[PDB]
Design a protein around this ligand. Structure first.
Ligand SMILES: OC[C@H]1O[C@@H](O[C@H]2[C@H](O)[C@@H](O)[C@H](O[C@H]3[C@H](O)[C@@H](O)[C@@H](O)O[C@@H]3CO)O[C@@H]2CO)[C@H](O)[C@@H](O)[C@@H]1O
Length: 320
């Protein structure tokens, strides 16, 4: 089933300069009892970032034993707690800072990664979908459509059923989506089960930094206005969509107002969302919705409100 309300659970991609890095010092998977909290809150879909260089520290080589086994245990815990997992290769279309499709990182190496991910986990009941690449941007934008096809081809060698979440150029901007996305119309999925996934932050530059407050001339519909280009493109092209990232600070009613209006518009169009972010090691990170003594998470009440409003059977938007 397709849940409209979900969360990112971040931590396994942390401290990206420390490779392989040490679990519990530089990066963090969910501890025991982690998923039971969110399951109790009524949240049942999780987007889970993974670092490519940790999963596969040499291109074209077998997956890393330590890191892949942590993914195994996370999916086991997800299954135990009725959580559906979207695995996210959280790499900005780059491997050790070089763009997929350059001589350093041929598309065949990215296809190899995706084959190994599907081969290892397509048999796991908690696996829901593959988000094949987080936020291509910059020098990767031009090459990303060709890389995406290689990644699709990779997953489909071993998993011919699950949805593939396909992000776009320019940090998968929902607001700028139609400026670049026409290049993705050439993508071919033999299983015909692709879902496009855009991101939206509502600070001025949409970086999700929220360096400033909302400001005097803040528009509560900014979230809706920034996903409208994406959703309208989906309708125009008969495609299915998804919002893989959106988060706001906890300290201004204007942000929550924009959130509530955004969720209402996504609900009208059966577009799921993954809130950025929960996770086991966020500290006082301004966008965290993980419980923390003395910190209020008003965003989670909005998520729960719209989870009870979820009456969709599949990814929208609906086709006329
Ligand atoms: O969206 C999260 C993602 O944001 C990255 O910052 C990006 C912004 O996404 C992007 O909107 C912004 O685009 C500005 C652009 O730099 C300017 O040329 C001009 O056109 O105004 C645009 C804003 O409307 O650029 C920043 C990068 O500078 C983060 O880097 C990234 O970590 C984050 O995940």
């Amino acid at each position: 089933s397709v849940d409209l309300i979900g969360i990112n659970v971040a931590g396994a991609e942390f401290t990206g300069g420390k490779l392989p890095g040490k679990h519990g010092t530089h990066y963090f998977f969910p501890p025991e009892g982690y998923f039971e909290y969110w399951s109790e809150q009524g949240i049942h879909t999780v987007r889970f970032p993974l670092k490519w260089e940790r999963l596969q520290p040499s291109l074209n080589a077998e997956l890393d034993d330590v890191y892949a086994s942590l993914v195994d245990d996370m999916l086991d815990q997800a299954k135990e707690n009725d959580i559906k997992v979207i695995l996210d290769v959280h790499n900005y279309a780059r491997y050790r800072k070089k763009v997929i499709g350059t001589e350093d990182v041929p598309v065949s190496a990215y296809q190899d990664l995706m084959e190994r991910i599907a081969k290892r986990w397509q048999g796991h009941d908690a696996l829901f979908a593959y988000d094949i690449m987080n936020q291509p941007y910059g020098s990767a934008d031009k090459l990303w459509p060709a890389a995406a096809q290689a990644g699709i081809d990779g997953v489909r060698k071993y998993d011919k059923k699950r949805p593939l979440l396909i992000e776009g150029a320019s940090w998968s901007s929902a607001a700028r989506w139609p400026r670049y996305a026409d290049e993705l119309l050439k993508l071919k999925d033999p299983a015909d089960n692709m879902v496009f996934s855009a991101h939206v932050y509502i600070d001025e530059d949409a970086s999700g930094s929220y360096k400033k407050g909302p400001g005097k001339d803040f528009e509560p519909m900014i979230g809706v206005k920034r996903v409208e280009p994406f959703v309208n493109w989906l309708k125009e092209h008969g495609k299915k969509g998804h919002i893989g990232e959106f988060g706001i600070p906890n300290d201004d009613e204007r942000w929550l107002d924009a959130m509530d209006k955004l969720l209402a518009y996504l609900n009208e169009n059966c577009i799921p969302i993954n809130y950025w972010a929960a996770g086991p090691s966020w500290g006082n990170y301004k966008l965290s919705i993980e419980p923390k003594d003395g910190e209020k998470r008003p965003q989670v009440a909005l998520l729960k409100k719209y989870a009870a409003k979820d009456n969709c059977s599949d990814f929208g938007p609906a086709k006329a």
